[PDB]
A paper describes a structure:
The AAA+ ATPase valosin-containing protein (VCP)/p97, known as cdc48 in Saccharomyces cerevisiae, is an essential and highly conserved protein involved in numerous cellular functions, such as regulating protein homeostasis, endolysosomal trafficking, membrane remodeling, chromatin regulation, autophagy, Golgi formation, and others. Previous studies have established that post-mitotic Golgi reassembly requires presence of VCP, as well as two adapter proteins, VCPIP138, and p4734,35. VCPIP1, also known as VCIP135, is part of the ovarian tumor protease (OTU) family of DUBs, an essential family of enzymes that remove ubiquitin tags from proteins to regulate protein homeostasis and function.
This enabled us to obtain improved maps of specific subsections, including a 2.9 Å map resolving three VCPIDs bound to the D2 domains of VCP without symmetry expansion, a 2.9 Å map of one VCPID with stalk region bound to the bottom interface of VCP D2 dimer and a 3.1 Å map of the VCPIP1 UBX domain bound to the N-terminal domain of VCP, both with symmetry expansion. From the density visible, the stalk region moves ~4 Å and the OTU domain moves ~13.5 Å from the first to the last state.
Numbering used by the authors:
A (entry chain D): 546 to 671
B (entry chain F): 471 to 587, 593 to 700, 731 to 774
C (entry chain A): 471 to 588, 593 to 717, 724 to 765
D (entry chain E): 476 to 588, 593 to 646, 750 to 774
The structure:
């Protein structure tokens, strides 16, 4: 149980089992789960990625969102990498090289190409 | 003046319209461009999976406007780079300048970038291309179409306004485009009416133009020893040169290009 | 001499004042300079987001002084670097000396630094020759060096020292007045319906660089041209088949509305943060 | 062919690609064909690639120009890429000819199994292949003990597109061959 937002919408922190029907699947739940203020047909994958810049080490885990029915909530290496670099190296010149590096790393990691395997993030609840 | 026409690529209506607007309109109606005070776009940059008809698109648009077509293959650019012979780029443009109107097509603008992998994204050959494009008079109808299988590694300075500013995504052929490609490939060979040429295109989803060409070549090479059985036998050897993982890069690059345009709601008072 | 005036940008009043001080006073008031014993500044370096009008600023200041303007783009620097022909720098300055007073402009002083990645040092052949020529200048022929860099961090510090490009000027994205001026300059010599509220268009394009606004105007003109061509083609298939009011005499409001659909900000908030942090670092010193 | 025992399918493919165009130009034209400009071998060293090329040349009575690895490397050293032109000219003079590159990967090997994958010598080889007229029946037969490091650009249609396996060292080639066959799993297409 969680707090409510007045109108009746639960706070629904990351990974919660929402009340919306899962248009997609591969979850055995039949409901859209929650992540960063949005509803997704299935839990995102996750993999660590190293961000090296100015001698700074960052242990940031990228959350991939492939296998999404709406075809609009699916992840995007360019957007994801831009967000990561901006969040961890805001306003630093030459960050585009780091963004390209992160894009390549995410593409390689997500290119395991075993669509049968999914590895949902380990989150309690459905 | 290529003999390739739009029917040889089939679909890509949006790309066809953009190419028309960028080539046919300035050449056919310079008066309207002068009236509206718009400078015609100097160039365009096709990006997409390998062997999807980028060269075919350039040749088709050249044929549509009946403009001379000059193809600068990637091996030529690498020859310039390895031998430090970038200066010849100048005369290459001069050639395109001489055969005006022209559609100067660079098959692989990223060939040099790929060949390099510590340095930046600037190289002597691409720098010469940039200098020629900047120093090119817009009065002469010379259009540069730079294909690229790696839209990111390409030098950003080439996408600057006044250059190959427009980026066009050439996706894998769809069902209609695949049917058109198969028909064009099987145009100089005797093919029996038994083969539908549409059901095949329907099944071979995600097959680049090169894949369809290889399938047809295998089928009619067996026939050299055409019928439905031989097409099926060759199709057993069919290979998808581009996998969905490769597609993702281009699909999501185009998606992020389109999402940046988030001012469509703008309405005047 | 450029034809660009300050109305083409119509913004950055402080930058205009500074440029007048360092380019206009020495050529307009030599008496004051020799009386006060203050050496004229050799040059300035504009740093800001891409397509923010740095070239426009240089052209406008050159036009105001009625001084010859010759611009050296980054591709030229890269040509002189790859070919190991840095000696050309010399003749370039000579040309600037010949057309005195002159405003030498380097579109991308960081182009060579970028080409090497932002294992060696920060000094290179072409920039070294530029420094050598700047030092070996008459200092009274009134030749002003206005470098322009999108990446001020990787600029060789030797360039940013007293007596050589001492002043760094931040050319930010245009403000509302600057955006209005840029739009008016772009739609100049173009037929735009008088009901097109360019003031509103500038108002709703916060964060758009000058290049972005030029792209918007070009897209509007392109849409108008496409509409004109389509109407002309429509004239036949109705005439010559079933045997005149101009379809599109001006770029109407709908054209700009549709153009704004393909309008994107080439300078994200992160880049603005980059440049603002650099300026803050310079100022807090 | 008796010099090599076995590899019946290899000979099948070799003669298919070489003998027919020289012997039946009319049949190829009837079907509107562009004969493959070349082919690439790959397998354990000393498996008979050179003698296979020689045998197919003998069956066709076509001259067999051999460019060994040392020649390609010598072209690489000293920036002698231009010599490639001459080699193809030497191949072109022999109208029915088989041009054999004993080690296409030798230069890629020398650079190390920092740059990309293209190099001046292979670049000139590609340029000559692209500009080689189909009327002159010159067949390029590349050979590589390490097909993984071979430049991908040379395995493109209009170039040495076909790859033939010429059989802990073997497992590498077996896995490579499977990787060239695992995704060919569309052999079920049946016409209606």
């Amino acid at each position: 149980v969680r707090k409510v937002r007045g109108d009746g919408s639960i706070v629904y922190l990351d990974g919660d089992r929402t009340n919306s029907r899962s248009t997609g699947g591969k979850c055995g739940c039949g409901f859209k789960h929650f992540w960063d203020g949005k509803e997704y047909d299935n839990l995102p994958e996750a993999f660590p990625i190293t961000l090296e810049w100015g001698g700074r080490v960052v242990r940031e885990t990228v959350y991939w969102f492939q296998y999404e029915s709406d075809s609009s909530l699916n992840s995007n290496v360019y957007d994801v990498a831009m967000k990561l670099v901006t969040k961890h190296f805001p306003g630093e010149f030459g960050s585009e090289i780091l963004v390209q590096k992160v894009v390549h790393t995410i593409l390689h990691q997500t290119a395991k190409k075993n669509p049968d395997d999914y590895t949902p993030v380990n989150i309690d609840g459905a | 003046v290529p003999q390739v026409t739009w029917e040889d690529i089939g679909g890509l209506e949006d790309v066809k319209r953009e190419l028309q607007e960028l080539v046919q309109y300035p050449v056919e109606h310079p008066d309207k461009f002068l009236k509206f005070g718009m400078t015609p776009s100097k160039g365009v940059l096709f990006y997409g999976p390998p062997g999807c008809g980028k060269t075919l698109l350039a040749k088709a648009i050249a044929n549509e406007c009946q403009a001379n077509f000059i193809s600068i293959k990637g091996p030529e650019l690498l020859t310039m780079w390895f031998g430090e012979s970038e200066a010849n780029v100048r005369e290459i443009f001069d050639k395109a300048r001489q055969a005006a109107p022209c559609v100067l097509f660079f098959d692989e603008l990223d060939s040099i970038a790929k060949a390099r992998g510590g340095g930046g994204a600037a190289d002597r050959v691409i720098n010469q291309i940039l200098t020629e494009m900047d120093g090119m008079s817009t009065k002469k109808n010379v259009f540069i179409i730079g294909a690229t299988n790696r839209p990111d590694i390409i030098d950003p300075a080439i996408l600057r306004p006044g250059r190959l500013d427009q980026l066009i995504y050439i996706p894998l052929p769809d069902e209609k485009s695949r049917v058109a490609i198969l028909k064009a490939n099987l145009r100089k060979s005797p093919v029996a009416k038994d083969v539908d040429l549409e059901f095949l295109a329907k099944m071979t989803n995600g097959f680049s133009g090169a894949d369809l060409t290889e399938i047809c070549q295998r089928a009619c090479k067996l026939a050299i020893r055409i019928r439905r059985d031989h097409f099926e036998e060759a199709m057993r050897f069919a290979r998808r040169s581009v996998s969905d993982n490769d597609i993702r890069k281009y699909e999501m690059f185009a998606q992020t290009l389109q999402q940046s345009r988030g001012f469509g709601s703008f309405r005047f008072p």
